[PDB]
Design a protein around this ligand. Structure first.
Ligand SMILES: [Cl-]
Ligand SMILES: [Cl-]
Ligand SMILES: [Cl-]
Ligand SMILES: [Cl-]
Ligand SMILES: [Cl-]
Ligand SMILES: [Cl-]
Ligand SMILES: [Cl-]
Ligand SMILES: [Cl-]
Lengths: 113, 113, 113, 113, 113, 113, 113, 113
């Protein structure tokens, strides 16, 4: 139930306070931004790379402090990846998925990892 | 059967002689100290992060030398984490758990990792 | 002479083919994007952090293969940092500086680092 | 101007939001805590090690994003190290130095490294 | 169906644009090159080591971005390692296996890792 | 069937040509050397630490090039660790076990890792 | 005085017994191989990248054990880099320089790093 | 003043309580042990590599906590390296130098790094 940024770009309200994580989030917004303009293989691949890399890195930082809610978080990550690997062109869904994942799921680890 | 420090702060008698481990132990004492003053979600979270991170790191150092009693040690770690993840406000228990874990369990790896 | 993206966001034409670098570049465009909306300390600070980090990381990568034109490149980096640290509110110049630095200066290290 | 903690221990108001930094800061408070009780070589050594390590690590993190006020910060660090290396037993000064260094100098790098 | 280089050495048409991967690929060509001249134990071992190392490293980089087609790729890697470990002297097969693997299988991860 | 050095110390005939491995092997001879003079808990602990660490490190290097005979090698390592963790005082057996392990089992990975 | 490989490719007689180094050397031979066929910017770039990286990595390894003849070695590296950066098309000189650098200069660090 | 071990081998009395350091110290005793038997280039080089690496590594550990007596310690290291690089065969001096360096100079950093 959060606003979908237009243009679809990362903004400080999505800040987790983990500099590296925030920078990775910036890439995810950009990847979706282009996918909305030109929904092709190249743009999907850019997003897919940045997404797989971010999710893995974020998982590693969560594991570094044995984050209590890692298991549920990882399943969320898997659902988005699955959606990108069986891409049906729903850019609006992806836009809202990333917004909600960061503000509701990623925010849960604030001060815990 | 060891005395519970008052104020609850790390002291040299808890020294394992592994500088990094000793520095991480200092954070667990500080975490329980505040939890005892204000037993809220923020302080539990600080203790939780430091505890999850310390246990993981300490486990990595033990596995680096294939510590003989790694398994039983890891089981102790799991018990405290589980207690913190199902916190019922028994600070006195946590205070004694940490003191005893370090002096009886952690001290077992002295010179072995 | 290169067109200035509007909205000011990274796009594939800026690709250096170095995954890490391209992702860091996406963060610089986003930094300038918000600076253009609200020219305040927080927005400049975000850009300043990402810029300082990216330039250093890029320099380290260039140094890793003893990049031939490292010195000239470093001097360019210093100028942007200096501008950011003696900020006068010229967002138009910053937008132009980044676009031209990546496409003429960064592109020069393609296949050399 | 800030209150000197009693007992002299780290607390959440000193939070910089960098987990490694906050954890290292906890070790410095503890180091000074014991110095005040027993002003001896061993207690000074513990603080000296934790202080030398923390300052170096924090400096490296500031350098990682080419922190704008690194030089002034480094000069502050050298002043404290110098006092520790030419110790005259002024624990009251040390207690105040650390409190003020974190809240006025360290707090300056928030969101920039 | 690609041409088998003669002499059997790495050339720019095999470029993946990942510097470290391309440099490891150069060692595989050199390995097969000598096995073709003197199909003995020492040359098989040199190739085996560089192949074992490259496949592992490439696999790590693929996992770094959770490469979508990692499983089928690892199965390919396994097939060649299996061949090298039960070596019967079919140099011509090894020559075409490497050429085809890089150009059809490795090329699939371009821009994805 | 190799000679058992007397004094029990590492010598160049044990060289694998991997500087770090050779250095770790030197610690193993020294550990057994003292265990022969004073077969106590401290000396067994020293050897055990260096042994667990060397075996893990050596296993990591073997895995780095997916060493062909890793499995059988690891089984040998486990046998010596098991003997140290269920120590019955057979110093002569440990002396010959190490000498033979390096010269017949470790030597197998020469040029392959 | 050493024979110049033809085709110009690395061979076991150039082995230093350092896995990483030898693998890097293989890239240098391949780089000069193509330069000899087509003396252009891309081929010189590929060799320049690999040469800069190798020389740096080798220097780091030499420094790791504080190699006694590091200075004389570094000077030789600078001479080759200088040549590549002020390229005049003398592929024959480059072929001979690399062969002789490895067999007379690199071989000097055998067993010392 | 300290007794020179015979056989010249590391023993527990030389313990600094830093695992890595202690293991590296074991390689230095072994290096000198063989030099005393056969004072040749191969034995001097083994010791030299080990000594150079140990000294550098120990210096890196000292610097990590900005060890207070780092300069005086580095000067000692250089003294020994110089002797090894201008070797005149005084094994007796070398045996005494290492023993005294560890027990008087190295011991000074106990609990400080
Ligand atoms: Cl995200
Ligand atoms: Cl603990
Ligand atoms: Cl840039
Ligand atoms: Cl501080
Ligand atoms: Cl390949
Ligand atoms: Cl062994
Ligand atoms: Cl070379
Ligand atoms: Cl020493």
């Amino acid at each position: 139930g959060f606003p979908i940024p237009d243009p679809y770009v990362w903004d400080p309200s999505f800040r987790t306070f983990y500099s590296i994580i925030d920078d990775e989030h910036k890439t995810l917004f950009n990847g979706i931004f282009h996918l909305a303009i030109d929904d092709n293989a190249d743009n999907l691949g850019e997003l897919r790379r940045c997404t797989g890399k971010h999710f893995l890195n974020e998982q590693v930082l969560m594991q570094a402090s044995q984050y209590q809610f890692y298991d549920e978080h990882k399943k969320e990550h898997e659902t988005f990846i699955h959606a990108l690997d069986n891409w049906k062109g729903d850019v609006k869904w992806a836009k809202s998925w990333l917004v909600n994942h960061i503000k509701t799921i990623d925010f849960k680890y604030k001060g815990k990892i």
